[PDB]
């Protein structure tokens, strides 16, 4: 798809792009943006309006291109896996995310000293991906600790990410989900699926609709709809699971609808049983 947006980029003295903010997708409007253009000599950066036009099927070719792809996900214009992100790691700079804005890692000790004349400097994060909410707050969502959702995450209307929840880029919820556990990069869960406190979804892997992962559970295989994983149980692709009298690698049960995975005291095994109903 051809996608375009006008945004405002933070650039170092040497032209490295620390960030770009696109408040809207597909708009040539600048009036939100012209008053934010300027130089910050304490951070040694310039903020400048840019217009970015990409082919979402092509691999990104520069930092601006990469930042628009992340915005397209979090604005929910594209779902996870529907936009090419190949090489994005090589295009994003590591950045010190402060209360004054993005700062370069190179020379940060001098930057901090300079900014400290203006007030207390707080560092929120040091990373190549910023906190999603500082760029887009999508409609119909709650996030308890907004450190834990990266820009590039897709959170559908009706989603709550609790404080224990975590959503990486190119990942998230396709419908209304309670997320109290970790959605890895490249993982999606569908409508009605609830991820229990401290649960881990590895990621290749997705879950369908109305699944329930218990607190401190884990899922290393794709599942379909209406599956349950008991609290405290980690189903890896290599976990041995008893189903209809034979032991299978859990990968053999990948994609299933309507299974409950639980410990079984009678066999001593992990078991998968039908979910009724």
């Amino acid at each position: 798809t051809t996608a375009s947006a006008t945004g405002i980029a933070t650039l170092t003295s040497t032209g490295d792009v620390l960030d770009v903010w696109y408040p809207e997708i597909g708009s040539t409007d600048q009036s939100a943006l012209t008053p934010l253009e300027g130089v910050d000599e304490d951070r040694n950066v310039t903020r400048k309006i840019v217009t970015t036009t990409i082919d979402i099927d092509a691999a990104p070719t520069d930092t601006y291109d990469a930042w628009l792809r992340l915005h397209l996900l979090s604005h929910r214009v594209f779902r996870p896996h529907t936009i090419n992100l190949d090489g994005i790691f090589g295009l994003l700079n590591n950045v010190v995310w402060t209360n004054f804005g993005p700062c370069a890692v190179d020379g940060f000790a001098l930057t901090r000293a300079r900014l400290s004349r203006r007030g207390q400097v707080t560092v929120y994060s040091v990373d190549k991906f910023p906190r999603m909410v500082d760029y887009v707050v999508p409609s119909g969502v709650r996030i308890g600790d907004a450190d834990r959702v990266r820009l590039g995450a897709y959170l559908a209307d009706g989603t709550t990410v609790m404080h224990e929840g975590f959503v990486n880029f190119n990942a998230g919820t396709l419908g209304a989900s309670m997320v109290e556990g970790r959605i890895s990069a490249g993982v999606t869960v569908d409508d009605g699926t609830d991820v229990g406190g401290g649960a881990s979804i590895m990621g290749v892997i997705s879950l369908g609709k109305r699944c329930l992962l218990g607190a401190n559970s884990g899922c290393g295989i794709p599942l379909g709809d209406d599956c349950i994983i008991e609290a405290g149980l980690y189903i890896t692709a290599g976990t041995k699971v008893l189903f209809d009298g034979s032991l299978h690698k859990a990968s053999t049960l990948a994609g299933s609808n309507g299974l409950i995975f639980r410990r079984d005291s009678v066999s001593g095994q992990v078991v998968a049983v039908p979910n009724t109903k």
Copy 2:
């Protein structure tokens, strides 16, 4: 109980209450508060002094009433479950919690653009419950990551909530506890009880005094005093546990004093054994 307090409320142009701060319980004093009254045209809100009087046994009837109930818990005036919170979810607005204060979710993209003339906008959270510490810091406590304690939490003198700890509203510690795991809404633990790193207490459920939950353990049943749950073990109400030679649902062991729950290599079962001493 009749409870009353004077506070300062943030109101939208249409009268929705984004927050109320009650610095003290039971005081008619305003001198902390009159200089904070005003309008913020970038957030399109007004901050106004209010006096709120409630019956703690009655269900809350408006947003102001709901916010005082949360303050009464975090100020430790009322313990969890001793104040009626029925319907509170329907009375609290979802709010964007920023470094500039609460903002409405409706029109937030315009609000952000307006505030950005003043400085970098950071969103801490998007939720109906704010971070407790921005309203009350109770005496004798430490909180590592204060994103992870909601207003409405009760933390008794001597409590440390470590970074991995989480305490929801209507929940917390009744005495001195080390909290490195998740205390769900409606859960309490009593004096001396320590919740290990990444442990999960579901919640109906409480723990008594001097209990020890190992790292990455779970507890889905009420327990009494001096119980231990081994690291990595999740005791759900349906978990089968061997005690005095029979297999029980762990719910049959609910309320016990002095039990250790651990994996047993000899039986292959979860076992509960006496804690000596």
Copy 3:
């Protein structure tokens, strides 16, 4: 070792040290620092330049001494366990870590009211240890949620601490590691070791090089190099593990190189098997 540095300390009206920042180790230079000296009457503190000289083998004797020891760790001048920290808990004050800087816990409700004339007050943490990154950002690292690394942590070049990661003081990574789980105080992991999401390393305990802890795993024993612990499995020192046909307490397997710890469906036991290769 004799270690010395010039820093700037925040002192209460009664002389309690809330913090000290040493921007550099071993320098008599003040030019970063003289403009930050002053009084803040809303917090009732003074910020003053200090020069601190210690013997790293001696127990710390005052708050200044304690804060330099933490900086020496995070600046990576000293590795964990190579600097005496005995009694440090008794020398650090509990502090309210705000967007305005450190505040005393005594009288904090008045302080908050005073600061609120200047703008929204946000409390990041309440603790004796601050967030490392507000004092030192070491080179070559990423930290997703910088609430979760305490000052006193040692993070070697090439380390990423993901959002689920946590690193305490006197703890961390000796080489390039992906940290998505909890490194307790006094725990180190060596080069190449990756700590999976939600994994717990207790701490006495270290891991060697190229170890892999699966998501939601636990490790309560020291291990050497090239060990793996399966996702969802907690190896405590008392866990019974089958190795070469006998059941051992996992403590008997402490220090091993090249072992995989996993659940075994054939025996019903935890098993340790050779890592090939």
